[PDB]
């Protein structure tokens, strides 16, 4: 550490990792319900488990970003954080919020209540008190890190990061606008989901990936920060209009089929940018950094995000294909690999970098940490292959041939067992990473 407040990041990572373990176990369960549909079919129905799989994903990824912000800000701003008390109060709000969500979904508390009961759109089912909690927590967060940059050194890393983070926060406000008109509802719903993941969150991914490469390779500011601004340019140029790929079939105008389909293809540019950025910086820079694992997650992140977000994205992004594959298992395959490479791996890469620093010791459990990456990445891409096949069989069987939903699903049972199996790998993988980060032991040879 250079600054003592950088250890707040360790509490954030701790909770986030706690929540990461719940998230994949939620996934495994969902997978198992797919092959064994009668399981807990009255106490824990699929839609309940799903909310839990998806929300804990959003919440833990955010805590990852918050944690990462509390680590990366003081280091770049050359000063201590404006107020530790705010950081802890922020995280307490978060933990309270995330507890309320778990307990509300499970037991169906206050069904119907405008403020206390669950809402009901994808990823935005949080009782409105929790949504409020998140905003209050986010604002506190934004105030706190902003003051720390204002009063310290400003750099390109810090700027992109603050933008992405500010944009992320403010776009969350759209989660409050729930128009009685389904088409309108769907249109502003993507302001949250897509302008997060392909907009604001992309800034955060690139700026943190900048900071990573900066430290692991030892290439200098000016080379890193050039590439930074270039990458995030191509992202916002393609990302914002590319929102139109979600505007094909929801009742928006026909013109989005063109705008959207074109700007979508351009979205593979920044994900290629980052993959190459990561690979050159390495080849180009110092190669003896002790933190072998934070390196691997970093390349892993930029690479899988390219295959996940870029290629599999492109694959179903043109309306000609999308007409057929929309709302299908194909969608499920993109989303998993895209989320894993761009955001999970990125959080895991930054966790692997800061844990040793935070514990003041040498990169530890490197073989284990790295084994967790192969096991999670291995199992994750295998899952996405298997769901592509399945989605192809579906798309054909139901969208060209016209066979009925349920019947077609009996046809792809084998693929669902294969996903479930691949899930065992991801869960084992994720636990091992937690272990590797949480329990330093004698290194493996």
């Amino acid at each position: 550490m250079k600054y003592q407040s950088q250890s707040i990041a360790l509490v954030y990572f701790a909770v986030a990792l706690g929540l990461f373990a719940i998230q994949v176990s939620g996934g495994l369960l969902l997978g198992w319900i797919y092959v064994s549909p009668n399981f807990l079919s009255e106490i824990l129905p699929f839609n309940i488990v799903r909310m839990l799989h998806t929300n804990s994903l959003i919440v833990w990824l955010l805590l990852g970003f918050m944690g990462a912000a509390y680590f990366v800000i003081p280091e770049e701003s050359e000063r201590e954080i404006h107020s530790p008390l705010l950081a802890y109060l922020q995280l307490a709000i978060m933990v309270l919020g995330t507890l309320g969500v778990v307990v509300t979904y499970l037991f169906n508390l206050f069904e119907g209540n405008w403020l206390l009961g669950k809402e009901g759109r994808e990823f935005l089912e949080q009782p409105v008190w929790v949504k409020m909690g998140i905003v209050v927590a986010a604002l506190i967060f934004m105030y706190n890190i902003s003051m720390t940059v204002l009063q310290g050194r400003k750099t390109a890393i810090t700027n992109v990061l603050l933008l992405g983070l500010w944009g992320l926060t403010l776009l969350f406000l759209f989660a409050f606008y729930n128009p009685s008109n389904l088409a309108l509802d769907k249109m502003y719903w993507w302001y949250v989901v897509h302008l997060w993941v392909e907009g604001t969150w992309e800034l955060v991914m690139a700026s943190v990936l900048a900071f990573l490469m900066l430290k692991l390779t030892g290439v200098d500011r000016e080379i890193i920060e050039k590439w930074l601004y270039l990458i995030v340019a191509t992202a916002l140029f393609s990302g914002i209009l590319g929102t139109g790929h979600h505007y094909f079939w929801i009742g928006t105008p026909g013109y989005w089929q063109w705008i959207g389909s074109i700007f979508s293809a351009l979205e593979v540019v920044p994900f290629f940018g980052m993959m190459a950025f990561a690979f050159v910086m390495v080849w180009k820079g110092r190669k003896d950094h002790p933190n072998k694992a934070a390196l691997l997650w970093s390349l892993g992140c930029a690479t899988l995000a390219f295959f996940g977000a870029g290629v599999w994205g492109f694959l179903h992004t043109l309306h000609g294909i999308n007409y057929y594959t929309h709302g299908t298992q194909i969608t499920a395959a993109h989303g998993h690999l895209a989320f894993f490479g761009a955001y999970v791996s990125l959080n895991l890469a930054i966790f692997s970098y800061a844990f040793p620093i935070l514990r003041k010791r040498d990169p530890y459990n490197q073989v284990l940490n790295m084994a967790s990456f192969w096991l999670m990445a291995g199992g994750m891409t295998f899952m996405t292959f298997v769901l592509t096949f399945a989605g192809t069989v579906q798309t054909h069987a139901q969208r060209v041939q016209g066979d009925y939903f349920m019947d077609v699903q009996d046809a792809i049972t084998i693929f669902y067992w294969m996903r479930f199996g691949s899930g065992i790998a991801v869960v084992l993988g994720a636990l091992l990473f937690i272990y590797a980060v949480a329990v330093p032991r004698k290194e493996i040879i």
């Binding site: 797919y34 009668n38 079919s41 009255e42 129905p45 699929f46 839609n47 799903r50 909310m51 119907g112 009961g117 669950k118 809402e119 009901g120 759109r121 994808e122 390109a156 009685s180 008109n181 389904l182 088409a183 309108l184 509802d185 769907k186 249109m187 000016e222 920060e225 050039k226 601004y229 270039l230 340019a233 916002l236 140029f237 914002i240 209009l241 929102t243 094909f248 079939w249 929801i250 009742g251 928006t252 105008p253 026909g254 989005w256 089929q257 007409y323 057929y324 929309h326 709302g327 298992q329 969608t331 139901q398 969208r399 016209g402 066979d403 009925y404 939903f405 349920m406 077609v408 699903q409």
Partner: protein, 145 residues
């Protein structure tokens, strides 16, 4: 050339935000006036959307191809049931189905029962119908969802 890349970024981004906000304002109006029928967006249809929401159908089903992938697309269930032009038969068809869930069938995916009254079934029926009329570029490809 770093300060250039910065300026391309800050400036060229702002450009595309504007275009997007313009485009959205158009699209918002296209939705309200042309692609969805305001007149048929009754109090029941709102109450239907709300029911849809609080019971969490979207986390098993998809609607206009958005949601979960566990159960049939319901954006067009009313057409699938040859019942789209008949509000009373739709209500009847929906009530009959929902009353029957859960099937309990071994090895088959399960839908809960929400304890819905008939005013409520009507709300859902009316909303799914109203959804079926959203002018959305001929999606889906057929009746199967």
């Amino acid at each position: 050339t770093t300060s250039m890349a910065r300026n391309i970024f800050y400036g060229g981004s702002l450009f595309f935000i504007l275009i997007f906000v313009g485009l959205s304002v158009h699209s918002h109006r296209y939705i309200v006036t042309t692609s969805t029928d305001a007149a048929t967006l009754t109090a029941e249809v709102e109450h239907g959307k709300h029911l849809w929401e609080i019971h969490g159908c979207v986390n098993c089903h998809s609607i206009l191809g958005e949601g979960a992938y566990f159960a049939p697309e319901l954006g067009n269930v009313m057409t699938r049931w040859g019942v789209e032009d008949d509000p009373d038969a739709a209500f009847e068809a929906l009530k009959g189905w929902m009353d029957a869930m859960p099937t309990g069938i071994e090895g088959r995916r399960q839908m809960p029962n929400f304890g819905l009254n008939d005013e409520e079934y009507r709300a859902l029926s009316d909303f799914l119908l109203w959804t079926n009329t959203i002018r959305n570029q001929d999606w889906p490809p057929n009746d199967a969802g």
